[PDB]
Nucleic acid binder design. Structure first.
Ligand SMILES: Nc1nc2c(ncn2[C@H]2C[C@H](O)[C@@H](COP(=O)(O)OP(=O)(O)CP(=O)(O)O)O2)c(=O)[nH]1
Ligand SMILES: [Cl-]
Ligand SMILES: [Cl-]
Ligand SMILES: [Cl-]
Ligand SMILES: [Cl-]
Ligand SMILES: [Mg+2]
Ligand SMILES: [Mg+2]
Ligand code: NA
Ligand code: NA
Ligand code: NA
Length: 326
DNA sequence: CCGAACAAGCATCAGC
DNA sequence: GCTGATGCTT
DNA sequence: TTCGG
């Protein structure tokens, strides 16, 4: 964290633009700037120095000069004073409350945590569970707990069907010492891009994890993506572990490598790689890499037999998961 | 100058 | 009900 | 807000 003050400032600006201004491109620009500065291996001495990095333009360069001179950004100082901005920023911290609902809640006088708790019947299901576990979902998961969670998930999936493969992705697969949640990629030979030979493949796994009281709540659930809540079991007389967000993604087995690339991330790494794919004439999603035709319409999926194959297509040298934490 | 900026699953809603 | 747009999320 | 053509 050579430049943690700068990257925190840019992250706070990004969140302001997303949550309050609902300006998604500004949000992305600030986040890209913070990510490129975060990996820059020198302590930044001037905006001009920072402007040399891709993603830092004139306006962010100027803010970095103000920050280095004074330790503060007046723009941010005033955003923190604004009650409506501060209200909206808080409400979006609840899972399921985004920029639109936060502002809508604002027009109704429902601001504080106390307000939300009094008006549970104004919340959809996702928002209600996000409020229920508001405190817990702000805590990080130590890697040691991620390992215990991995063991439960993999073993419970094995008990349903030994042919399932469950892989923990996200920051865990990138080797992080702590994670914000648990991301589980799931495959089964019956589900490929060619056929679905078994129904309920994701459901059966969700059900088993509920039976053993690992999964405790559901935020959303369809045939290939589960979003919910889990909790490690605690010993006698021990305080309970925090409840944790879990995401499970069932991916066609023949498309595992595109799937595990997507689900390992980071999010900014994915955006950067997909942007580069487009410049190289390809489009990458969690399923396939496809060439872009002369008019820019995706062609047919290219053959992929490793994560590295995807990097090769777009002429990037391979990056291990630990080096994708952008 | 100015168009593009990653891609998509699930929940919800409007309109038919 | 279906379709398509939108919100929220990964 | 930034970049690329
Ligand atoms: N193309 C894209 N892909 C994405 C995007 N958002 C998330 N993802 C992908 C990449 C993430 O690693 C993966 C998990 O998403 P998660 O939010 O859990 O991110 P972690 O890397 O695990 C940080 P942690 O706080 O959870 O520890 O989902 C996206 O906008 N666009
Ligand atoms: Cl914008
Ligand atoms: Cl500040
Ligand atoms: Cl693949
Ligand atoms: Cl596809
Ligand atoms: Mg995660
Ligand atoms: Mg571009
Ligand atoms: Na730059
Ligand atoms: Na939120
Ligand atoms: Na996640």
């Amino acid at each position: 964290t050579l430049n943690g003050g700068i990257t925190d400032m840019l992250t706070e600006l990004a969140n302001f633009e997303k949550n309050v201004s609902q300006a998604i491109h500004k949000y992305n620009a600030y986040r890209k700037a913070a990510s490129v500065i975060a990996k820059y291996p020198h302590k930044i001495k001037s905006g001009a120095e920072a402007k040399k990095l891709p993603g830092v333009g004139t306006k962010i360069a100027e803010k970095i000069d103000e920050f280095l001179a004074t330790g503060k950004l007046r723009k941010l100082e005033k955003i923190r004073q604004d009650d409506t901005s501060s209200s909206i920023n808080f409400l979006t911290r609840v899972s399921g409350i985004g920029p639109s609902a936060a502002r809508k809640f604002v027009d109704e006088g429902i601001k504080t945590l106390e307000d939300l708790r009094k008006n549970e019947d104004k919340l959809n299901h996702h928002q209600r569970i996000g409020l229920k576990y508001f405190g817990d979902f702000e805590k990080r998961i130590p890697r040691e707990e991620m390992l215990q969670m991995q063991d439960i998930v993999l073993n419970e999936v094995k008990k349903v069907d030994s042919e399932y493969i469950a892989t923990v992705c996200g920051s865990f697969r990138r080797g992080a010492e702590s994670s914000g949640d648990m991301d589980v990629l799931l495959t089964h030979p019956s589900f490929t891009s060619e056929s679905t030979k078994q129904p309920k493949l994701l459901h059966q796994v969700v059900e088993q994890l509920q039976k053993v009281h690992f999964i405790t709540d559901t935020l959303s659930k369809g045939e290939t993506k589960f979003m919910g809540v889990c909790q490690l079991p605690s010993k006698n007389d021990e305080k309970e572990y925090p409840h944790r967000r879990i995401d499970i993604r069932l991916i066609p087995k023949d498309q595992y490598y595109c799937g595990v690339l997507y689900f390992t991330g980071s999010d900014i790494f994915n955006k950067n790689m997909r942007a580069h794919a487009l410049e190289k004439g390809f489009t990458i999603n969690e399923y396939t890499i496809r060439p872009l035709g002369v008019t820019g319409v995706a062609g047919e999926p290219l053959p992929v037999d490793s994560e590295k194959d995807i990097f090769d297509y777009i002429q990037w040298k391979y990056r291990e998961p630990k080096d994708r934490s952008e």
